[model samples]
Target: SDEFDALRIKWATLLTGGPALDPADSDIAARTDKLAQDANDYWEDMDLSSSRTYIWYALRGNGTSDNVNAVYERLRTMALAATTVGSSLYGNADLKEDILDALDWLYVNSYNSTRSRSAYNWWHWQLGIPMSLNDIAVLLYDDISAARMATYMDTIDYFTPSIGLTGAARAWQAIVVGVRAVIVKDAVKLAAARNGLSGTGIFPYATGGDGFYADGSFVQHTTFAYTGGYGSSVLETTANLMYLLSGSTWSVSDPNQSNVWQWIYEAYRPLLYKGAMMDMVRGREISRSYAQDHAVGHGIVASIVRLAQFAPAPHAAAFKQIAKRVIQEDTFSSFYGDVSTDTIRLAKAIVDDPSIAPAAAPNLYKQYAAMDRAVLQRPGFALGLALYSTRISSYESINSENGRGWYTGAGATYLYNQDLAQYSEDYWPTVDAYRIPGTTVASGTPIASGTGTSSWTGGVSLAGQYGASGMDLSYGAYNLSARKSWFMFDDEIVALGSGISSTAGIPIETVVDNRKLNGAGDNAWTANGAALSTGLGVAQTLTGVNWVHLAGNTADGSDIGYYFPGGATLQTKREARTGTWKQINNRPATPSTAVTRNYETMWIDHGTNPSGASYGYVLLPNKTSAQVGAYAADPAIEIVVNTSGVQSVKEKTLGLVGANFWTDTTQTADLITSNKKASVMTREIADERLEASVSDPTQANNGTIAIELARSAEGYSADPGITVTQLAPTIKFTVNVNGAKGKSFHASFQLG
Candidate 1:
């Protein structure tokens, strides 16, 4: 026990800022004491993993004598080893000797356990082990005898990029290299560290495949466009390293620094609705019972708080609002027992800076070119469309442990509105995974997740305001192939699918929505301007109707109207669905327990087997049954071409015609001109302005495809000013048209 007396004294001295080696003497004893108390309380709270708790205790040194919980202590010892350097730097020479002994103890006694595997132990070796080890070596350069430093480096030989990694994993490896560079003073190594952040190897940032895509799309762990999941780690580490190296010779001066910061504005900011993040970007892990059980607003609270420091003025203010709101509302503490130091620091910064003020951002629409994802921010509504292609993965795999997420990116859609039932946080794991809103699949037994670039699945957008979007899904697993299109609008969205066929052994249906509703009995399901005999919580088929809809569905403070064309047999199922929350994620699979919940699910079956069957629907966000009926009867929208090759919709209300041409190298609608293969186009009926997006969907890249606009349909004179493209379409600008298997080109022009 006496052996730790010196270590204890150094800890106390460093904790109090007593000025032995703490030259910039500041009264931080209270802060340190509070941190120690928080750690001790969290340990007693019994919520953290054994390794995470041990590390927290190591920061305070109060739990050293208690049961060590030695199952996993390597990361803790490494962190403790770094603190020893800080303590020795601030205390007496005798403290340095104690610190050296502590480091050596970790090397000899705790090192073996870290060499093995856990859920994500391999990933952690990049961040936790090498970063901590190199951090101490850099902080106490002289004290780390040459042999000791080499041993530290040698221990991390397995953590190099020599093997293979991508996305966030590679970024973490880069951070390790940067730390090692700091210790060895290797500029080349430091340069190598910075390259990966911007993307590396075949999947670079510009292509929308990895790193931060130009359209504000960010993916980590490969095609996982997870700005909140792995991208959160990427941005945090980048911010941390930038701060740590400020004023140093190896300061990060990447020319793209401003661009990276703007990414927070473009891709990252709009997703934060109020304080919560949209579920689409939360990735597979958050959709299940993981990471504080996927608490609402947890991801943005974790991400935006640290990122606030680098955010521009308006974004910084918005970031501060997010941080302040999360803490005041106790969002994080609802799941985790306590918050991280990063969060605490952000809260303090906001309070301490009087200049920072809350600012609400204007509504926005952004489409990720590479990730094939789109997000729209409208008044009182935020919609996320998670569509996958041959380029992007459809869903993550975990079967016996959890239901197949058949709807994750297979056109899975979400609308976050005022009604909590619309897209409730806890509703995901408990509700049926097969009938996710905005998805179409064979209503059969569980299907495995999609892999590689999808057959013909991808879409295009115009300045995020509106886009003619489509996916040519020919997935044979379900014996299905279809061309689906969605013409997004501010208050409503028109959905059309054509050239649909299914030969599966089971019924193939396109689910309109399977959302937690007001209730089975309270929620109203009406058809043909009348309430159906087969009401909510019942599964039955009804035929021969003009339109089908749900009334009394709350959203944006009104009864949201969901309408589909009638005459096709309709099936509705609503009930108190009981299920479990389980996932085989990067973490160990957990046993699940029953969770009772409720949802109203409705869909259209394409028969048990069919060829070229099609369906169309329109979603009116804030409307009633009468309003839906009016729209249905006096339908301002028409399904122009719902054939095997193309599907198009002309919305007379908005003076727009949206078309998805599946295979025509050159084709045309009555009011439009198409001169490219595999393209999506939208024409403004009033101005005859056409926005055309062309991409090689199935192949890697299609070379120089041209799409034209018809001047006769416009009824306007040719004006170059009208056609002046401010934000150039991505087709030409994105170096590799099919960078990640799907390269797209967009062109906008007004016809005279």
Candidate 2:
């Protein structure tokens, strides 16, 4: 096993409280307790209600082994908690249903919808997507009824060939589908559709765009020169494709494997060389170098490792070399060490005891911490790289910040590791929290407990423990910008209608006499701070009624509705209030236990509005809505938006959805700057960055006073009475950006 056991021992010793070989060692036990205690301390009173990876890894790593019942119980508990604690889509009683729906979706849609089944066949998860289907199959593999597998297979338009995603890119999938089919002893027709053999597939290894040299080096498409060490950096993918296309001939021991394998080793050489990595981590944005997905190398190792377990002795060498390198220095880079262990362990279990459940490792926890410490906000890289990293940050920086910065299966996995590392520590070192209005703190205190209010608050709550349950939905172009909020305290707010009718943030500006909190619309929620100070038509305005109200369409804006705290199906789009809105106490009579519930009034363009043609949001549950208030300190709220969906943004045309989360906490993200200065952690610290400067502002005219919500509506219009069509709200954050006169900045969120 390439002596991984020895190297792992070294790492364990290095970490303060890692597991000790001697079970009776009290010191070792103390270390473990301390680490776990710190983790709990991090999350205490913190809102991680929307975290997905957090729960997944927590249960996985913490699951007990050898005790099958205990493992299953833990898994089930986590699975149930996932759906209800935060967002509603990932898991719950509805989980199995969603899984089935996804299967149905893949079979009925996918290949049949897009021009070529090519892309659909190769990527995309959920419903009929191969990747997700594969995951589901594995999770329920042994337990899955043969009939269920058949249902998913029924949806396949296998071998559908179109464009761009030709045979060249299909090798890996072919191998996977083929192998799975063989294991299940199902239809052989899937194998019949193989590329290189499936009359229609583009033969694998036919270097597309960036071809490989005869010697198997990855030649840069940019310079068209052989990349140092690695032949074709593209070779990483090319090899997988080759292995898939070559089928049985693609074993690691095969002579042809050297060319493919050598290229992987070469391409990763720079990353393996820590000097370059640290430079990016410590230097400015321009110095922020690129690190190709190390999973490329790790994956090759994984596949080979699986084979090494049963393949000829020579095959062991292939897995060993890669394992050696991965475990040595690159271990921290991509959670290589942990992933290696997991895969080998998984293979062992399936090979020896198919029913054995896997237990997570200490490294599982460490991977998440290391990755964040190493790279959340570092800059300077290709747009693709930037997009990839930022996308990850949006999800990790704050739980569920990017509704649309949705995690790909791979992202879920990366986050799986990230959570292991930081889950115990509630997300911390947030933006501008230390300088929160009205609050004071000492060094080492976390920034989540700020005390203050922005200059804009008309009657919004400012206390720390008022509204911790409200969610911060995403709203700007992904990877670009975001705006979010959380509740501060319980408001006298009430829904306009009896059932499901909500009234938080209702626009009360039009009724001047009712401007005060005790006035006619007095009890309304002003989530976006639209009160007597701001003009009536001002956003978060609760005038005729909150536009996000289900009645806004026809119920004279007085209709009752349901809120969809989104996830895969996270956001609570307004649903008609069941006739029992009041009978049910303005809350879901029996809300899905899989998800937690709260209520708020938000502005969503809803696409068809006449004003600016963008999405708007509104609050939920009625005046007696069960929505709670902020109950913690310096609580941060961030939002993720599908700005790319606006169809009006510049980058959207280029196929970039620019999803991301925005918060006062700049500790883990890019601060949009007018100067486009080089982003270097060192530089930011050397000189105060936004996080520091916001605390001790220069007395004179400070930077901009406004917190911009980067919107994308092509009408070139305003939002008072005008509306456009098709603008969907994605990013929804709650932050406190204040003018100099304000107490401090405070932001919060809610739902109805």
Candidate 3:
């Protein structure tokens, strides 16, 4: 009984920062008082009459579940305010009495043992309400009678009889059961909670469904790439449970429990750029006005800090390093304001400690083939690519969220650099979605969420520094089809698109970029060594543009340069845009207030009903205008081939070649030849040494892919997946990609 009481105190401390917190700290006091104020407002507005079935009129829809859930959410906040050490509402007897009476009302009319299963949005009845109720009961453990507590626990048991759900839902249900068990001091329920948390679907790597994949991909709803949304929830809830039960008899001892740490390093670390989760993996949560990218990232940082308290010494050190870096790098928002008081205390400790140094930002190319995404992070910039195949949906639009997200996953490109707040705030709601960068769009009527017909939507990474990614886009609805490829190098990224045939009877265009301008809506712009107008509401179609540059804010460092080989015809616009979050997500919680932002948009207009059109460009981040002009005049990279069957590029300075074979046919690009649908990246590491990476992007190749390089090799070292067959005349190898799931295979050769 004493141990159970201690566990309850631990849970309460996690929510309200406990009695040891300094009441004089301005940030903590403000946050604590804000919770009390919010609870007071809810208490004033709540209609707690027997005839009034709903607590809040705005949430009283046809479904009574949401109304009842909102009541519990407000009550939980009130309980925290009552228990928190620094809050003015702390130890208020009148407020405590009202909170108990509200619980009585919830037990009698809303949630009870005899109530039927939820008729709509089953999450509220099973997971949301139970979770909130458990927290409230723990916060007021001394105030509530045992018989009344049993009635509430019985209601949770009636709805969530078992933790049979998967992914984030399973973790949340497990926490509900576990906390309820602690309140009742039931060992069997505690064991069930521990077992539920250790379910294979939660910890072990998932093969094909709603779980974390081996390639650092987190998927939810079976097909959505959701590392920022549902994945974040899984991390937060599981970390809390692990910390709550640690050092106790019900502590988690599952061997697979270590996977959570691996997920932190693999699945999540790569997606965060300068303390913002890449929106490509965030799913529909991007449409929520309140849960923007930076806010979500702050939540994750706090959860990791909580986990570090109970993790092994080394793991704890590394986790704190990550938390400290995220908190320090996110200058756009206050991490202290977004997290709980306890988390703020822990993170502040990491921040104040001098021994824990922040880890450097990653410099690597990663392809999440299971989720059809790729990220290339360099010292000064990061590029995120979102693609969808038959195995992955282009976008998700359930419950009226992400209503205009039809093209986000259709080769959409996100560039993150010095402008930390470019995509934050109101960018998503205001920016044009159909003309998302890196996407070839056919102007037509709006379409709903769906998957492309083709399956070639992955890439190969070489030495973790270079990569070749592509996708065969075939959308019959818009009568659009194309083959797109991105070759990532150290200094620049080359994007090639071919076979761009569109029969939609409307104009087609490929967006090169749509960057948000600074506060004044003006940034220096230039083309071919000449300055363009910097005023807002300027639009132009320029011909024979060799290169273009947009000056970065001196305060934040992302100067972007676009170079076109030979030349290009481009359309540019500098304009102001206004929109509302409700335009994209019709949820009641989404704000309808109009927000405005300025943008500099650029695209290439392909004529109507075009056939076999192709385009090539290079993105050079953090480069100057003069440097872009000089580089364009003497380009180090050359496009070897851009066709329907194959696309390839060669960076002469690095002696690197990247190729993507779109079809299973013999195709030649530069000095490399492949007889299968594969992505390959090769480079001469030294005069007599060569390195190569290959993968079957289609994930359907059962046989080996025959590859040939023009140079002969004397000896070679390769992964088990590659088999060298020849060393004379020209080097040759066979890549065993059978069931490889788009995993890249590497090989090194000693050239003759």
Candidate 4:
């Protein structure tokens, strides 16, 4: 037979990691638990309470409304809670006051013009600092004027340019600003903000249509609003804005033109009718400081109020059902959907003709003294639904109709109090990586005998069924003694595969990895919209779901388009452009090999390495889009792995590059192999020590190697983990160093 077991014993020897390897074992829960714990710990250690901004703002934080209204209630509670305990909850009222004061200082004083802080981030202000403060402003002041409000708006107007306020936080701010504009009837400011939204403002922000209005305005990345970041929240914001804008068809510039309102309405229509599904169909939590729960409630309240203004009958009627659905206190016990409570009661009043809450009453003329504070305790983007459903049974008692907006604010206070936004960083901090290292041997030979001598950069690939000859279901074969680094299907795929051999017989190979996704690009979001992904809608496959959807720049070619599921890379971006994605290319080639199957040369770090300037870095298993495009696309660089010839970026080739592909102080750039536990680059080769994981079959594709030079304390990102062992002779990897230097990842695989 051939020297390298093309599809046999060779690959079988290197298989490792992933639950798919073990069928009988159930680790679904374990993985979730681990992920949560790790995430919690990571956030906790980062002093995240101060800087934590979530993208789930579209969801409810308050525990009042149906689904929308509740999001902020929880956030408010956290803001209130923070005043007492060091707890991120904002739960403490005393602490909440301090935040409000800070906002006051920043809005009016801290700026290049005022020179408060050392250097001014003139372009924008992070929402975390102000939003947290706003929590207190809304709860105590009733009018929702934390010193941070006007100052924040001024800061936005003065700094960040037209595109500065685009992403989620900005978009959320736009809604808040628009609502406030309505309350105060400030047509000029509202129109200005709208211009930014529509890219028509006199000084519009340069946006890429990715929810970013102007240049460098990554509003979608706001961690505290649109849970997934820019994509969904922007849509939600536009929807809310549309509804709000539609209320008074009389255009601000032209009192007779209803065109503006129609345009706004047409721009952001509600796509999901199934009660805005916030998070993935799973439990979500918040601590308040990092994420305010009230935002959701407030948002829902605001949206519902606005929706009713558009269509008192249809909007109100549908909202009532939605309220009943989300607050299922009777149907399911008001778990959490989207609407908020303050708004819920008001909506019901509007539709059912019950007593309306006071037009401008602080409490809507209702008693909120006994309301549950947990509604605002959770952090993350507050959902409107959580607030509305707080007390579904007695929902009618709060609002009787005639409820006014947050402006005139009276009794329990106006239900709608959203305002101008902040500069919250939208970064996802998790990624997964793997690496490979293999040898070549002859046919029908056991790996132990080690017949032939050759080397390959990528590990073997489990292209067809693991052991199947051609390709079918039944497969688990792994044979290797030789080393030949050739790719299958033209070197496509990065990590795992999930096609049933035939989705109508069309090469339906579903490659799973964060770097290069091969499914529908647009369907990143789910059916209900929230969760799963911040923007990629849903890749509703007949079998289940895939991140792949119609994803690509509305203007560019996908080949030179944006990428996803990646994080920090060799940073390369301008201070202006906000919504565009990054790209890169790593031209790798098999320049050299050894007679003993220890191929060694060097591959280049050709693309824009996202891993900052450091060398060592670790690649987690998951990542977000913001983190994916932060790199400057560099030309082909060199790295050494598998003694195979140097793969350069200039050549325009991408290997099954692992996530961790770097070198640190301790990690010499000598033999580039990822074979250690905490190694940046992992190899397909291993010792008998990894036996337990390999035999488990359940862990087959879960373990293996990392694809990085070394785990850096700080630096650019690297490849995710590897299934070198899982594929046996088949090695699969999603090369993050795509063609664009400093900005892209690719899909590739190797057959032994």
Candidate 5:
């Protein structure tokens, strides 16, 4: 009984927070006070009548499951304020009674055992309502009778009787069931809850289903790369439950549970840049004004802090370090305001402690090949690539959200540097979706959410630092086809496009960039060593432009430079764009007020119905105009080949050659040659040491890929996935990629 009581107290503390809020801490105190104020407002607006089933005017009793759940959520908020110790409204009699009465009213009229399954948005009935109800019941445990709580539990059972779902949905259901078990004090039900949670598919490494994969990829909705959305939900709920039952009788001891911790470092950490989650993996949540990139990232940081209390020693320290770093470095949003009081306290402890040093920003290259995504990070900047293949959807549009997200997964690229707010603060609603940077578009015709026909989409990373990625873009509906590749190095990124043929009878343009400008629309710009106008509403198509530079808004911010390999034509524009969140997301909570943002756009026009068009450019972040001009005049990066069959680049400064062979025939690119469709990156690390990374991007290879280097090798280091076939005349190796799943394999050679 004492153990059960301890579990109950932990659940209550998990819900309402604990150790009492400090009145001296103004931020926490104000936040607690605001919670009371909001609950008071909801109480004032309530019309609890038997004739009218709804609680608020905004939510009518028309069988809309989400609105019904919203009422319970508001009541749960009131219960939390009433039970939270040291709050302004702590132990308030009137608020507690009102919350209980609201719960009773909702149970009888809205969410009863007799109610049918939800007609719209099944998540509300199965997970959302039950979760809020359980929280309210636990917060007011002593006041509510046992029989009444049973009736509420029965309503939950009627809807979500068992855990039959997958991914985040399954985890949420299990949590709801576990909380209900705690409220009823039933050991059997608690055991079932634990089993349900531990048995779900979210914890294991999946190969081709909705879960985390071996390659650090998270997928949900069967085909969407949802690390920042559903993946975060799984992380938060599972971590909370793990903390809730750490030493209890129902503690989780699942063998596969350790994978969740691995996900923290491998799957989630790389997706976060400074404090913003890359929108490439966020799915439709990008369009939500309430949960932008930073907001989602803050939620994740709070979860990490909660899990740190119970994680293993080193893991706990690392978790706190990550939380502290994100909380300290995120200047865009207030992390304290976005999370719970408990999380605020935990994160503040980490931030204030001198011994707990924040982890430095990551410096590595990762390819989430299972989800068709890649990330390349260096010291000052990080680049994320989003592509689609036959296995992954190009975009997701459900419930009228992300309606214009046609090309988000079709080779969309995101660059994160000192300009931290580039993709936040209404950027999604205001920017031209068709002209999303690093995408090739033939026309603005709306396309449905579907998978691309091509399977050549993925990348290879060398020694976890450099990368080469490519995609064979083929969309029959758009009548567009092309081959795009990106070569990432320490200081710059080389982009190449070829075979850009289109039969859509419209101009096919490759958007170079669409950067957000400050309120004054006054981000300084230059081209070819001459200053360009910073005024708004400017548009021009300039030729013979070798390089361009755009200054960042903040004084300490880093500048971005663009260099064309050979002088080329470029279309540029500066304008003020206006839009509303409702245009991108049709949810009732989305704001409809118009928001205006200034932008500077650049693109290369391939002309209407063009054939065999190509372009080459290099992105140099944190570089000055003079540096860009100098590099352009004597570029150390050489485009070895750009064709439909092979796209490659050679960085002379680094002695690195990155190539993507598009066909199975023996193809040559500079000093590297491959006999299969694969992505390869080779580098001369030292005077006599050479390294190489290779991968099968198609994910359909059932044999070995034979690779030959132009130089001879004396000996080689042993790699399990690579076999040395030749040594003296020319260094030759064969990579067994039959089931590699796009995982990069490395090999080293000793050259004479």
Candidate 6:
């Protein structure tokens, strides 16, 4: 609406400062400081005016940041110089001529050529050359020659042919086309550009090609959830182009682009807590450089904050609240050093207009079934379940430092209290890769790397058809098969796993808490039932332990406890886990060496080569030693069964029973049994209601599978919203729900 244009222009003036600013505005001065600081810090320690192929780090540098740095700096310098001229001030004609020369150099000498660069892709060149170059031409319209701009556009069109392109790269390719139309004033290019990002038009296969799924899972480079990496980039660039074309003849107001907002709220919002993203959605890219963990999040924070300029009032409020929280908390230290212009603008907007209240903590249980992951956001903490399947490759496929990372997210669990900064920046490349939290693996054995899939197909389902109260994960990777289930509650979460086995000769070990806390000498490792002291580097077996607790602070510098039932052997060790960044990847600096740091890790051995062996433990986040002992005495969580047939946990206090049945054959439980092999979890209260979730792993039986509830449907209330025919206590699943392999279904029975 033109009504908001007045406000929007106020924002535009801050970005491209000029006489458009109000004389009384104090922000005009603030904008100067912000843009000047951005100009200096954007290059950091590296030289931005170097060759297109300057050494960025180790082997990965070939115009990675240099080209990007060149483009943005040119644009910023031009904007500042133009504003100075408009405001009747002397502009730097020398600086203007230098940027023109830089642009001309980029047009001819840019590193987009695939003939020489081994790691480069057409999709990569399109993002740098076409997208940014076209934008720069818009700002420097008269300065750039028509012949030069046409040549630049031709180079962009020469690449990005849209063959097998998917993910953020494809989206940017579409942006290049759209921006090209704007430069040349072509209607066909504009429409083609819109369809390019939406992946629609005459090409119907575009919609489902890649990017995001209806279930809120996003994929990039083929098989990574990548919501934090490629996904965030897609959102930022997409929103930028959308804002650029607002109120134009080729506007993107069509209903087709509405999913852009949906993706923000559904897929991206749930991953963010207190303005920090959970590591599950971060993918393998985080291991490249620890500094990335501290930097990548600001872009996401920037995008969410910018959404306020165009989103509806309610969403604007919501967006501003999140932006305020993130900026206020400084989750990743994204705004810690000198800040960016966009961030400055966002903070100013919040202060100028404090009407938008802060959003509440999310209490959501969402599963990206297509992506093989689940998320639970409760009051006190948030938990992530990272699983992999044949349908999706486990982590990365190419050889690198993360080659052994196949199991990092397979059947793995990550818990976050205040933030993810708990895991120190060097945790992954330094910590025991095998003992990474919430994993069952072969200890002391070298994991094979570079291009492979898990042993069997695996999957997970969320609250509803998957289970009643929480979520379930069936991971069968590396010949290590286990059904791991997590049931979420207010104060605590219950984890259970069974059907565990391995064919290797190595000892199978289940890591309880390998958390990087205070050094082994600084803190104590204790088990309540047995008396034990410091025994570092020595693997000793303990008997009859009711509960085991690590007497130290967590990554967040907080205390925690590990509670186990029917306790088994225990061991502790303090080692100087050391490595260089070079060990993680070949694409680092010449001297990527790092100091030998230390981490204290704890694990439970399930015996060497035991057929179908298993272990169980509960992680209590932020609990003290004394509190853990008390909670250990009244252990309300019990393993109902842990065998080849079923793996289930009964939380007496929460009135919840969660289970995963391995076969299609009838498997009986305390409440019910089913002929089809499936996964189900629920809460039951006498005379209250029967709430449950059911899912079939075998798509062969998602249809007409019989479910016998403990009570009759007529006995409960009209949760009659369920269309399935009620056979007293039983209901038939007529259509098989297809998750990775089957559909997850949710049902509720109330007191009528």
- Residues 1-752, candidate 1, lDDT per residue (tens digit)? 33123322322222232233221212122233344443234334332442332233433332221122231233233223233322322333443444455455555644433545332344444456565565455445556688777666666554563323566666667777766665555567666765555555212455544577766777754666576566666666665555444334555566665665555566567666544556666566554554422244554555566556555566556777755654454322331223333344345557557676554543765666566677777776667788776666666554243245556777777776656344443576667777877777878555556553345555555455666566767663557767777777656777777767776767878877776766544666677787865344567766665676665455334355665654466677777877555533222234366666667777888877777788887777656678778887777777777776677777777666667767745666645445544545454545445554445444444443344444433222321212321222211211224343443455555444
Candidate 4 on 112-135: residue-level lDDT in tens?
A: 234332122211233322333333
Q: Over 4 Å off in model 2, which ranges?
A: 1-98, 105-128, 142-147, 158-168, 176-180, 183-211, 219-258, 264-271, 274-315, 331-341, 344-752
Query: For model 1, where is the 10-residue window of minimal lDDT?
Result: 725-734
Clash count for each candidate, listed in order shown: 8, 125, 0, 321, 0, 18
lDDT of 5 at 63: 75
| Candidate 2 residue-wise lDDT at 248 | 39
Tens digit of per-residue lDDT, candidate 6, span 1-752: 34223323433343453343442345444545555444334323333465544312222233554334445444454445444322222244544455555555555555444333223443346555555566555545556687777766666666643323565765677666766666666667766665565553111222233577766777666566677767777787677656555555555655656667667777777776555565666776656664344355666767776667676657767778876766665544644243334445455667467676666666776766556667777665666777665444557634354555656666677776653454546666677776777777777554442223432223334452223221223334345555565655445566665656666666777766666544543456567834455544544556667676555443432456677777656665666677766666554232376845455566777776666666777777667667778889887777788776776777787677776666667776766566666666667776667666665543344244455655555443222223455636453332244332444566666533
lDDT per model, in order?
0.56, 0.24, 0.87, 0.24, 0.86, 0.57
Clashing pairs in 5: none
lDDT per residue for candidate 5 within 4-115, as digits (tens), equals 7788888887766676655567667766887878888888898866576567888767478868888888988888888876576789888888777777777777788776
The parts of candidate 5 lying over 4 Å away from their true place are 48-53
Shift in Å, residue 532, candidate 5 = 1.1
Q: What lDDT is reached at residue 321 by model 2?
A: 46
Q: Write the per-residue lDDT of candidate 3 for residues 129-221, one digit (tens) a residue.
A: 999999999988899998888888988989886778899999998999999988888889888988887775588889988888888999999
| TM-score of every prediction relative to native | 0.74, 0.29, 0.97, 0.28, 0.98, 0.82
Q: For candidate 3, list the clashing residue pairs, or say none.
A: none
Regions of candidate 3 where Cα sits further than 4 Å from its true position: 48-54, 60-63, 113-115, 553-556
**Model with the higher lDDT, candidate 2 or 5:** 5
Best by lDDT: 3
Candidate 3, poorest ten consecutive residues by summed lDDT: 54-63
Model 6: lDDT to the true structure: 0.57
